[PDB]
Every structure is written in structure tokens, then in C-alpha cells.
RNA sequence: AGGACCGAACCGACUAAUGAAAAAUUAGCGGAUGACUUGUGGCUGGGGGUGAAAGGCCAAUCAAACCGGGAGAUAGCU
RNA sequence: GCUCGCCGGAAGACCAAGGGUUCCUGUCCAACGUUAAUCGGGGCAGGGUGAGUCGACCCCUAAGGCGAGGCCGAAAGGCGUAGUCGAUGGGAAACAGGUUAAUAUUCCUGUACUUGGUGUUACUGCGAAGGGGGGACGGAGAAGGCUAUGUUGGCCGGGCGACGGUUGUCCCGGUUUAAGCGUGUAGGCUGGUUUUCCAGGCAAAUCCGGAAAAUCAAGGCUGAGGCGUGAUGACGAGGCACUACGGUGCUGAAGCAACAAAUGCCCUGCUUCCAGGAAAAGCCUCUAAGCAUCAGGUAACAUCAAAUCGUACCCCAAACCGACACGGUGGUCAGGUAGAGAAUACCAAGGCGCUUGAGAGAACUCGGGUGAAGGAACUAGGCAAAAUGGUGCCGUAACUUCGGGAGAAGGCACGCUGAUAUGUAGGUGAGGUCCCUCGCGGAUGGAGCUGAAAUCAGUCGAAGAUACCAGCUGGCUGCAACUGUUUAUUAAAAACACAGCACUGUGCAAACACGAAAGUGGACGUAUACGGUGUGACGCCUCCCGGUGCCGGAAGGUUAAUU
């Protein structure tokens, strides 16, 4: 049982990319960013409850914050995580 | 020619590490002394 | 029995085996066996505090019963067992009482003789009882200096005491060094020699045998510079001085035992 | 069977000529089931360690490591 | 794009470590790249790393570390018990195909497995910080059974030759398929089952151990591979539609047999040797306190569960260690022809041509080739070169520790074709036939397949171990017995070590060594042991105690603190 607040708190946003529209495309799986504290199942009840739709499974992973140079100065971009959520057959969504 | 400077993570942090200068004195010291300094890099800690 | 092998190489000409058929070839009673790690003559301060050890054959301690306290039940031998601990062979006996345990074989034991403790215990090898029970005159082996301790002295694999004289609460023991030593008459003693006896005819015959049983090569002091031992130095073959330890002791006679508590127990030393 | 033999890997380094290289190259050379070699981790600390002993090795540094301090040592010398 | 050339036990493929975006796409060429650069491991932007079963995490421990109390220590602190950490070792589970520009045992397709809960009905002794078993273990050697894999034939598809021939004994390609489940074989280990008792396993034990007694000779455990299923599937040479010339979608034959065969598996096996070969947990089992008709246990069935972190890329290197786009770096994979071979040569798969080129064709330098006549006259020295080089057979001296020396030396044969023998000796081994406690069985049988070595006859060359590869040999002699070790980076030796010998110490709280100490090593050893010193295989051997040491003695002389 997840408290709605930390659902809420869950989703950082929609990962708009090819890769990520073959999957939505194709196998029906919607990549997010996520917390990077967010667990798998955390995730999955936040999908079903704020996007109202099964969820068959989440993989997630770890993305690494590339190292960028403004300029003279170095400087590092964020981590955060990534998923892929796999929703049940004839779950269209929005 | 095999160089002197042979990498391993894990001897590295057991040698040097924070933990190991925070375990005796003398490297609680070390650490006092480069905090003093300013050191930005307190220890061979990534 | 001794074996001479044949010179088919160079540091096989000069060895001799020593090859006893009755031990027993196969794993040892593991229920006895325990863990034994190498030091490398190295304590807890991590120096090397005996030179020469280092090294040698994965070795595992078999635990042998040097204090032979069970009174009374006689025990039947099952079999003679290659210990790697010691220059002599352990038996491998079992008790009617179904308990297994590892004694030092003497001389004449073999698989099947039946042993005995006690004080009652009749006066045959292998048998252990009271020196105050041991009729003077008699060879014992692995004798106790206090009672209830464990037997310390004649343990080597063909060694053996003499009880010369048994006089009140002491008996007055004849060492293998040949010091005459009392010891209280209610330690305890194994009748009759230990028994490997032809243990020192062997002869490694390379230098990779002495490797084998964990002894690391020694240099000599005068092959040295003078800043590590007292002989080195010297331009040739020079040594101009009296001998000496590593640490400028002398070596060649000077005595060193500065033992006053146990002065009293010694009848006579050795020579 | 073998601190056995010939011989690749592997370990070394006797001869030779010649910066890509703060010790290498090529051609040959020794060992190659053992006192072998090797990975990972561990322990031994400076008048101390370790040393099949050469004063060898101890981070390209060793008849006393490196870092900091006494310290602007002292210098009838340049 | 077509040729050429190089690597191919690597200069290919996959990892660990280490690096940390170098990966992919677009874009730019100031700087960086030893030149140019449209290119890049460079700049800028964007994208990319998907796990119940891989790894970490996690459970267990080794060396070792820390260490409540504790012991010790001016202080700091040292050692260490209970404990707790510590992999490089032990511990549950996944395979095949398809897919991305870039991930995949992680996505998808199919087919699996695991171990937890929870709920069930069924049953009914469960229970550990404890007992027992197990895990659990060396070197070498030898085979036998296998597979990986390869070759040939068969089959299937395609072909009929840019130049003489090529419808055949011709040419090219393909002929693959997992884990899992069932079977339990080649083979290895062990005698089983029941009953009774017992000073043992810190207590108890129905378990282990030990005694007896009965009865049956088959009982159990283990075990590669094969076979069956998995699979009416997938993949499949190439054909056929579209084409952003990158590719995408449809389609799809055969898919067998024999032989050979590992260093891989059975094998943690077997045989043997001495130098005598981790631990703990998981796992099985036994009970104790307990609880007692509850829980817990096992039984299937249902459901839920498996979190977290890593996953890109390089990894014998231009990405790691070397200041560099400069030698070092552990593991796994191991095709063909020749060959003993992981050597060597040429090749496959795959990957590269080493980030300055163009000319010229002096000296001189480097690395190579050949050389009349001489053949060590060179030189400190045959340094370096040259030479030898294989298999089989013949043959082989002194001396010897009887093993050696010895590959001593020195010689002969060696190609191809035919015949012996349309392919032999051998190896393998199908049908058929017989037996059978019935199977992965046993006999007989020999088809087919493979296949040396030799002899005889012929034949070509200057030459047949034709290339690469591949000992120079002998004689006297010093030193060191020998295999070993050594000055990382001018010394590899006659130096060190060595087995052996001798002396000497040391009676165990050993001597000695590290430690203001506690303690630790010595050693879980005990004089057939340990320490120190010298000598140094083996053989024949091996006067002086005055000096200095050490050992013993203590009559006298002298002699501290003290008084």
C-alpha cells in the first residue's frame, strides 16, 4: 500500500524519444522518468492510479549524467531513472 | 615494462579510503589537516 | 624398511626412503582432523620471529591423545595412520565403548592388539598407567611432567625413557638427552618405545625434499656484509672472530639455559 | 618414477647488432611437473622490514625510503 | 566499388580488472590528430544501458582485520575472548529463435525452471545457540566410454563454363535446432533389510558409533553421453514483391548416414605415490527445553513474490598502467590443408594496410641475398656469420657413482606411379540370424566407412627429411657435485643455496626471536625435536690449549652497594 502523496510524487514525466515511440508503438510500453528513489512497484501504482491502466510489468534502469563543459568550466548533468512500463493488452493511453 | 601504478579500486579505497583514515588516530588527523587546508577532495574517495 | 633408490637422476641417486606396507593407505578419520594454517615462523606482530620455516605441504592436524584418560575400557587398535604432524606414526584405536581415538604407535603395536589405561591396566606396550604403578627398570614413552597434563617427553619417533629409581613421591626419569630428571610418581607414561624407529635413516637427497617439509635454505653469516650478521664482511674468505648468533651470541658451547624454577628437578644434566 | 630428456605456451635474460622505449629490438639463448609459474586478497615499516646474501629490494628514489616539521641547521668554502 | 597485400592459438571473438560516454545519430573543422582532412576516440546537440534464473547485493566461511568485557601499557595505545567483518573459495533457478542506429540468457516469440511466503484440503510429532552425516577437497599416471568439432558420402537447390576439355567418378552452396521433461546407459562406489543391547557423541536422542543375532544376494547412491519428447515449430540456400539503394515485407528445398575426434565431459571417478592434501553455511538427519490436540511439519492445489544496484563502449589496447593516438596486462573461445603439435607455412570466419606523401636510385649507415681462389691467415677471442637440423634402421669408445656417457661418433633409406592388396594389416561397425531376467540387453555376423607401415617393379629431377621448421661434432683441462638463486637498469659466476657432514645449545612456561608488557612465533612440536655456527653430493681422508674465546673448578688474593 503506497500513500497517494509519494504516488504523486513518483513521476517525473513522459521520455518522448524513437526508441520510446516504437515502444508505445509496438509492444505497448510507455517510457517515463521517474524519482530516482522510486521502486518498481512504486511506479506501477502510480501508473494505475494517475494514469487509470493495467500495468503488466516495470523494468527500469539508471541513466548516468553525462559530463558537459559550459565553456572553460566543467560540469555534470543529473542521473535519474528510467522505465519502461509494459500495460496490458488493449490498454490505450493518453 | 610492468609500471609501479597497478589500479585496483577496492585496495585503493581499503589503503587510503575515508573509512580506513577515519579508523585510527593518526589518519583522523590527516583528515583534520587537509579540511584546514581547504582540500576540495578530502579523500581518495570517489 | 629403508629403500635405496636407484640413481635414474641427479638428486634421486642419494635417497632413501623409509617404507612402512602397514599404514594405512587412505583418508584419514576425519572426525579427529582440524584445521591447521602455516606461519611462516611469523607471530602476531607479523615478523618473522624463526628463520627457515616457510612454505611446505598443505598439512592437516590429526588429534592425537597425549593425556589417555580412559580409565579402564580397553581399546583394540584399527589401524597405523601416516601423520604428517610428526616424525612418528599415530594408531588409529577404538574403545568398547564405541569412541575412536589417535594414539602414538609404539614399537611392537599393530592393527588388531588391544591397549589399555589405568592403573589396574596390565604392564604391556601401549598400555599407559601411573609411574608409581610402572615397575622401575621399564622403557615408557610419552610421559606427563605433571599430572593430568598430557604426556611431554618421549614422543619422537623412536624415542623412550628409562625409570631408573622410584624414591617416595617422585621417580627420577632417564631422558633420551640423557638428563636424569625427577618427575612426581603420579604423572602418567605409555609402556614400551614409540615407534618409528628407522625414521632417521631416511635421507631427503635434494634440496627440494627439505622444501617440501617447509624448511626455507640458509645462508651463513660469514657469506653476508657485516651490517646484517656478526660474520659478514671481509674481503675473500675471511671470519676473525669468534662464532656467534645473528644477534652477537656465542654459539659454539656457551650455555644458556637460565631456568632457576625448575633447577630442583634436574638429577643431572645431560653430556 | 623423475627438483629426468627434446620442445611451443608461460617464466627468464647468456651473446649479438641496433630512443618507438628513463633498459627496448630483432636474431639467436636457459628453464619449461617444479626449490615452477600466475590471478585475487592478506601480513611484515625505516636503524625498521625482507633478503637461496648482491648491501639486493621496500612506488623510475636506498651503506638507512618518502612527506611535513626543528629550519633561514651549519658552511674558516665557491 | 573492384583488384592487391597482412594477421588468423591473432593483428579474430567474449569477459574480468581498470577506464567512465570513448557507444549510436546529426552536425562543425579554429584547436587536438606528428601532413591534408569533407574524417575522428576532436567540438556542439540529441539518443542509447530494460533481468525472479547473468553479476553484485544476500547466506557461509579462509588468510587476515576490527573487537563488548578482559589482560597489558607514562599518555597515545598493544594483544586478544565472546563476537563481528573479510573471496580469490562453498551456497536456488533459462534455454532457443527474432529484433535496435546504438541493449539484450535483460525487449519480443515460443517453450521452461526456482524458493519463499499466504490460503487450502489431507494428515499428524514439531521444536536448537546443541548431537551426527554431508559439503570436503593433493600430485602424477592410465586408459575406456563420450561429445564439441571436422571430413566424406548421401540428399536438396543451383550450374554446364570469357581459353583446349567439362551431362559427369563434374562444379558451388546448404544439410542447423537449445534448456527443460522422460528414459537412467558406458561406467564408479558400497553388501542390504529387520531385531536386541551399549561406560561413546559436554545433556537427550528413534540419528551417528560400537557390540551381538536373524535373513536375502540384490539394495541403494552416483553417472557422461545416446534415445524420445521440446519441434505440424523455429532457422534455413537462396527465390519473389517494394525500394529514402540503408534495407523492409512475403516465401522457403533438403535438413540424413558413416568415419575421425579433443587438452572438453563421465572423472570431486579409477590406479598409484608421499611431500599425506581449507573452512563454514546452505542440504539431510537426531533429539532437548518447550508445546500439547494449537502451532509447527509434508501433501498437492490456488494465488501472490522475487526488491535494490550493474548492464552502453574499450579491454594484449588509440579508451587500462607507461607524460604521447608511445613496452606491460589475468581468464574463456581454438575451423581447414600439411604436421607429433596450441610449433611452422598457406588459408577460413573475422579483422586490418600500422595518419605524412611524391620522386630519385650518390657516399655512408641499417636489415638482407650471392660470391672466383684460399678456408681462421681475422681477432683479445672463430665475436658474427656459415654449418648441423627430421623419421626409421644399422652402429656407437674412454671413463662410470653401472643409472649413464649416448642423439656419442658414423652411416644407409626417404619423392611420384603401379602392383602385392580395383584399399592390405588393423580400427569401426549396419542389416540379417539366434538368445533373452526384455533393454540404451547379450551372442553371431560381416555390409559399408576408414586406413597406416612395408616389399617388389617403374618413373622424373641437379637435388625427394626438397619450402617454413629442424642438434654442429670430437679431444685435453681448471672451478663448482648435480636441478636451482643472484646485483629490477653495465657483473649469472668459481658467488648464494643445496642434499650430506660436524660442533654447539635447548627437558618444555625449551633454547631463541618480536614485543617497556600483555602476549605471539618456536609448536598444537618435546632431544629420531627445535635453534645457532661452520662445511658442503659421492669416494679416500681429515701435531699445537701458550695467546683470545668458551666450559668446569673454587683453596687463596683482590673486590660494589650495604654497615
Known amino acids: ?33 521517474v524519482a530516482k528513489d522510486a521502486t518498481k512497484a512504486e511506479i506501477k501504482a502510480a501508473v494505475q492510479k494517475l494514469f487509470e491502466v493495467e500495468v503488466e510489468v516495470v523494468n527500469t534502469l539508471v541513466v548516468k549524467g553525462k559530463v558537459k563543459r559550459h565553456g572553460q568550466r566543467i560540469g555534470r548533468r543529473s542521473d535519474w531513472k528510467k522505465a519502461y512500463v509494459t500495460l496490458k493488452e488493449g490498454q490505450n493511453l493518453d | 615494462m610492468k609500471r609501479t601504478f597497478q589500479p585496483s579500486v577496492l585496495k585503493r579505497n581499503r589503503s587510503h579510503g575515508f573509512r580506513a583514515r577515519m579508523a585510527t588516530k593518526n589518519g583522523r588527523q590527516v583528515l583534520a589537516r587537509r579540511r584546514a587546508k581547504g582540500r576540495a577532495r578530502l579523500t581518495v574517495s570517489k | 624398511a629403508v629403500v635405496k633408490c636407484k640413481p635414474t637422476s641427479p638428486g634421486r641417486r642419494h635417497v632413501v626412503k623409509v617404507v612402512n606396507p602397514e599404514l594405512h593407505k587412505g583418508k584419514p578419520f576425519a572426525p579427529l582432523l582440524e584445521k591447521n594454517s602455516k606461519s611462516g615462523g611469523r607471530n602476531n606482530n607479523g615478523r618473522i620471529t624463526t628463520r627457515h620455516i616457510g612454505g611446505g605441504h598443505k598439512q592437516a592436524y590429526r588429534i592425537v591423545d597425549f593425556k589417555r584418560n580412559k580409565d579402564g575400557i580397553p581399546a583394540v587398535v584399527e589401524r597405523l595412520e601416516y601423520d604428517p604432524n610428526r616424525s612418528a606414526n599415530i594408531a588409529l584405536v577404538l574403545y568398547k565403548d564405541g569412541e575412536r581415538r589417535y594414539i602414538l604407535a609404539p614399537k611392537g603395536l599393530k592393527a588388531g592388539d588391544q591397549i589399555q589405561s589405568g592403573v589396574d591396566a596390565a ?28 604426556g611431554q617427553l618421549a614422543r619422537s619417533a623412536g624415542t ?28 602418567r607414561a605409555t609402556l614400551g618405545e614409540v615407534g618409528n624407529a628407522e625414521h632417521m635413516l631416511r635421507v631427503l637427497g635434494k634440496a627440494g625434499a627439505a622444501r617440501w617439509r617447509g624448511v626455507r635454505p640458509t645462508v651463513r653469516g660469514t657469506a653476508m656484509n657485516p651490517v646484517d650478521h656478526p660474520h659478514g664482511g671481509g674481503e675473500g674468505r675471511n671470519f676473525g672472530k669468534h662464532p656467534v648468533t645473528p644477534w652477537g651470541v656465542q654459539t659454539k658451547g656457551k650455555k644458556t639455559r637460565s631456568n632457576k624454577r625448575t633447577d630442583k628437578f634436574i638429577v643431572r644434566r645431560r653430556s
Do not use: F, W
Open chain 1, 1 to 33: 500500500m503506497i500513500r497517494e502523496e509519494r504516488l504523486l510524487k513518483v513521476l517525473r514525466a513522459p521520455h518522448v524519444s524513437e526508441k520510446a515511440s516504437t515502444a508505445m508503438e509496438k509492444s505497448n510500453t510507455i517510457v517515463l522518468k
Open chain 3, 123 to 150: 604392564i604391556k606396550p601401549g598400555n599407559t598407567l601411573p609411574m608409581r604403578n610402572i615397575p622401575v627398570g621399564s622403557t615408557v614413552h610419552n610421559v606427563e611432567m605433571k599430572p593430568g597434563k598430557g
Open chain 3, 160 to 187: 623412550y625413557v628409562q625409570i631408573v629409581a622410584r624414591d617416595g613421591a617422585y621417580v627420577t626419569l632417564r631422558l633420551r638427552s640423557g638428563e636424569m630428571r625427577k618427575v612426581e610418581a603420579d604423572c
